[PDB]
RNA sequence: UUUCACUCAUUUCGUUAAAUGUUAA
RNA sequence: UGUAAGUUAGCAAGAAAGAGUAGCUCUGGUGAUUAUCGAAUCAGAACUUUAAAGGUUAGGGGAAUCCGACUGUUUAAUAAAAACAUAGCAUUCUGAUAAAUCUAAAAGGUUCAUUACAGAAUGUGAUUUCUGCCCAGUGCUCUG
RNA sequence: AGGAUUGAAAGGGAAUAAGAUUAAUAGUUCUUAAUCAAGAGAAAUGGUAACAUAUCAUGAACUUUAAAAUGGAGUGUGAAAAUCUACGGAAGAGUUCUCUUUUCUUCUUAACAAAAGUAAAUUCCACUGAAAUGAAUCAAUCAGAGAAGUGGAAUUUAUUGGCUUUGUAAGAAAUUCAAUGAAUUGUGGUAUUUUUGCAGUCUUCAUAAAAAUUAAAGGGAAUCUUUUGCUCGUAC
């Protein structure tokens, strides 16, 4: 169908090759489904910027703007868990 | 056996949702007309109200009164509890069988009030409490 | 000359905030005894989209520590919160994401958000999407703690200021390139009237200090003192430096 | 075809100005005023449309019979049956756990 | 307007003291007994001539009776 | 005169002015 | 049926270019229901003539150069554009009791139902490739 | 108990229709037929369940939930109307020296209620437990937190309950005939458009009103007939 312009062929030929490249990565990850942390189903889809909803599972999760979990938001959860364990133990 | 006569269950669905009942007869296979595993229970439809020392003794009788019910219920719509009553004490419950229940017709009112009086007198003596105390969802 | 556009902005006639569909004020609940000396548990009923801001808002419901009823609060979602979650606010709250703790109980290195600059003022710092503040150190002598603001500045606050543990949801919002003028037009649907910005050099000498002559150019340096009156303060203000940074 | 006219003095195709054109004796076509489409009820927890209650205007519920505006169950009309079942189990299981965990463990 | 189905109700209605007027209509196939009450106009479609006569005797003489035919009054 | 300590005018805030402080349990 | 150079590989492109099309008489494909019933659609064949989209409706095409990237806006009544906007790029200030800024004053007002992924002030004008040297002069600034 | 005034003849909103009538007003008058609001004369059953019962079958303070009350695009489809058409007719009209079993017109029905017969779509309930993986759409999409199958319950579909049908109601109205009185008023379509709903899909750094007002729930405090419906606009 297309050689390399997969999802950004809807933009035609009018936004610059570099800009169409950057928006392609974000638009693919924004429209994909993610593994739902409570029922382990590929059933989470974005409803609004920052709000993700598990379809066959009935849960609303706050997340990144275009991805369910951000890299910055994942290390922080790891960091707080380590901090809490150290504080709770002595 | 989890579901045995004298076992106290809590009804999960239907008009009597949340009421506490007592198992009388168990049938996990189901009859010809009953295509499901059921159990015949007798429960407290309206729990007795608390009373103080100011009401007249005739008020304390009607306030502590218990309105009961008898109903065939699917075993998937009851959650058995850890409390067991003595069917010897509640001998009126022991007479509630599957053949006592007919489909579509009113259960005999005289029998219902008979067990209702038996429930009330037992509570007036305070012997059983968790069965007669109301469940707050 | 005329009155420039920055002067007309301070009167607030067509530049008023377009806040009609907004959910409300997003903040911690008012401080009380049960938050000072205990913990109150709230339930995250739902997560909603507040117009004009990039982070989602949580409709938390505390009960009523002193009366009968419900205390419907409206928090700013931390990343990872979900519907039906329980969150605890108070001095004895556990160090979990979404919990509200005084900034003194957080171990050094904890990442917080929606911090109160003053005790009980219900949230000031680290409120945009994906933003957070880090606890630097404590000082039990005068009950002060040091935090690192999202701009990099260091600020000292009282040790009993409240904050929410985690990261404000909706991060990475501004990395997606707007592509069309129309898309930028829709961004200010629930904001002020600022978008289509005419360059000062394209105006006339009456309209703007930059309004030029036979060639589109400024003419005088664009770095100005902080003390310039409103009307000529156009461009870089109190600029310690200019040009591309190295 | 017979062309018609608005009977009331509203002249705009608003939500409350909906009309229906029906036939009438003599081949003439008359104009009716049709009611707005309404939503029903929702479970207080899961936000699902309840069964057993019609989708009518709020005031028309008073005209209906006493039994036709609710469902004969605990929290009937405000919570679904699934919503209610979770309520009962939570109230019973947590209370039972409290008796064993604390209260003479 | 309301329609009564069987013969028992109309006589009970006729014997009731809430009546106001009676109009009888004869069609090409059936006979209709429209009873004008205070609120509604009850009617009864009758196709049996003998049963129609039984109805006509059931009408109290005090009430006014209107007979309608191929020509309206 | 400078540097301190305080609050008491003064500023900026928050709430239904809803357990502040000190003893007691 | 056929379609080039160029290209951000999406386009150019209805590229360019050629052939067919009427009337009448027929033939076949595409289903429903279980022999009866039903739909406009496509393909094909003899014959005839005044050789057939054209009553009406209904793209002229190609090779290049300059400017603006594009969609958009504009001097109501002589300028519709290469001008304005735009997305993208870059710079400056501000931790909110702030920055900008209206007011004679004000428990006054706007961005702000806001909190640096934010607010306010500017230049350039998509993409690609690249932004060289100069701090003397005038500004701005210094933690001096 | 919590916050004053005003602000919409296109936003929210209790309740009416058909025929007739005037030189001119008519959801306003008349005939017929309805509806709404405010008044007057120890407390229920059935169903396993989803849930159901001509008012029935008590339900105060207080609290919560829902409705009023929510963008747009595009696809599929239910129903009504219009147009076209199949079969069967009844009445009238046009053409007719050339033919034409011919061409045209009429064959209708309200608000509010009833429940013979019978639909489409979605969501739930019970039995059972799917792998050799199945079920399904134009597209999708779904399943051991339970598919498909069978049997049920509910809601929506321009008023009751969606369509035919019924009461209103043929006594009206339309088309003819006679001189006020007489006649008829079937059944369909795997066709097009419009209107109105429904189902899922796509899209947003856009998420696309509030109150008056109504109902339900948690809690257990207490022990059919009839009257009236004011002010203002209403011509063109």
Swiss-Prot record, chain C:
GO biological process: cytoplasmic translation
Keyword Ribonucleoprotein tagged: yes
GO cellular component labels: cytosolic large ribosomal subunit
Ribosomal protein listed as a keyword: yes
Subunit structure: Component of the large ribosomal subunit.
The protein's role, per its UniProt record: Component of the large ribosomal subunit. The ribosome is a large ribonucleoprotein complex responsible for the synthesis of proteins in the cell.
Protein name: Large ribosomal subunit protein uL2
Organism of this sequence: Entamoeba histolytica (strain ATCC 30459 / HM-1:IMSS / ABRM)
């Amino acid at each position: 169908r297309t050689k390399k312009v997969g999802i950004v062929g809807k933009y035609g030929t009018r936004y610059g090759a570099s800009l169409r490249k950057v928006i392609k990565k974000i638009e693919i990850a924004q429209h994909s489904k993610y593994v739902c942390p409570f029922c382990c189903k590929e059933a989470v889809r974005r409803t609004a910027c920052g709000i993700w909803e598990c379809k066959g599972c009935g849960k609303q999760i706050a997340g990144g703007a275009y991805t369910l979990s951000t890299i910055s938001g994942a290390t922080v959860r790891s960091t707080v868990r380590r901090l809490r364990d150290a504080k709770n133990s002595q | 056996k989890i579901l045995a006569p004298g076992r106290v269950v809590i009804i999960l669905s239907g008009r009597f949702a949340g009421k506490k009942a007592v198992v009388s007869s168990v049938n996990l296979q189901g009859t010809k007309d009953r295509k499901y595993g059921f159990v015949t229970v007798v429960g407290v439809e309206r729990a007795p109200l608390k009373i103080t020392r100011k009401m007249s003794a005739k008020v304390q009788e009607m306030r502590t009164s218990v309105k009961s019910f008898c109903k065939v219920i699917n075993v998937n719509h009851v959650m058995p509890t850890k409390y067991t009553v003595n069917l010897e004490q509640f001998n009126l419950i022991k007479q509630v069988k599957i053949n006592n229940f007919e489909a579509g017709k009113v259960y005999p009112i005289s029998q219902k009030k008979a067990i209702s009086s038996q429930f009330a007198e037992e509570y007036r003596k305070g012997k059983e409490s968790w069965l007669f105390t109301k469940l707050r969802f | 000359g005329r009155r420039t556009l920055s002067q007309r902005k301070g009167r607030g006639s067509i530049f008023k905030s377009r806040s009609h569909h907004k959910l409300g004020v997003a903040q911690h609940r008012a401080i009380d005894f049960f938050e000072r000396h205990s913990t109150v548990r709230g339930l995250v009923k739902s997560i909603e989209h507040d117009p004009g801001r990039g982070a989602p808002l949580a409709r938390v419901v505390f009960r009523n520590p002193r009366q009968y009823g419900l205390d419907k609060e409206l928090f700013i979602c931390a990343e990872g919160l979900y519907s039906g979650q329980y969150i605890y606010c108070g001095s004895k709250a556990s160090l979990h994401i979404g919990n509200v703790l005084p900034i003194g109980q957080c171990p050094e290195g904890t990442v917080v958000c929606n911090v109160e600059s003053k005790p009980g003022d219900r949230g000031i710092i680290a409120r945009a999407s994906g933003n957070y503040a880090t606890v630097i150190s404590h000082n039990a002598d005068n009950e002060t703690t040091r935090i690192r603001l999202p701009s990099g500045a260091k600020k000292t606050l009282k040790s009993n200021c409240r904050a929410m543990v985690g990261i404000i949801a909706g991060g990475g919002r501004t990395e997606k390139p707007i592509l069309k003028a129309g898309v930028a037009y829709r961004m200010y649907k629930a904001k002020r009237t600022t978008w289509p910005r005419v360059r000062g050099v394209a105006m006339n000498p009456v309209d703007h200090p930059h309004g030029g002559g036979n060639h589109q150019h400024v003419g005088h340096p664009t770095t100005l003192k902080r003390s310039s009156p409103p009307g000529q303060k156009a461009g870089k203000v109190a600029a310690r430096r200019t040009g591309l940074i190295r | 075809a017979v062309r018609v006219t608005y009977v009331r003095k509203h002249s705009y195709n608003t939500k409350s100005n909906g009309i229906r054109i029906v036939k009438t004796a003599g081949g003439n076509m008359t104009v009716q005023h049709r009611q707005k489409i309404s939503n029903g009820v929702r479970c207080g927890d899961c936000g699902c449309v309840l069964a057993g209650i019609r989708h009518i205007r709020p005031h028309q519920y008073g005209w209906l019979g006493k039994s036709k505006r609710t469902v004969t169950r605990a929290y009937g009309g405000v919570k679904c049956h699934k919503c209610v079942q979770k309520k009962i189990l939570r109230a019973f299981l947590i209370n039972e756990h409290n008796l064993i965990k604390l209260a003479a463990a | 307007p309301k329609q009564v189905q069987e013969f028992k109700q109309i006589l009970k209605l006729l014997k009731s003291g809430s009546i106001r007027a009676v109009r009888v209509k004869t069609n090409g196939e059936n006979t209709k007994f429209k009873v004008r009450c205070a609120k509604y106009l009850y009617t009864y479609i009758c196709a049996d001539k003998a049963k129609a006569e039984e109805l006509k005797k059931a009408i109290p003489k005090d009430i006014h009776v209107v007979e309608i035919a191929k020509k309206a009054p």
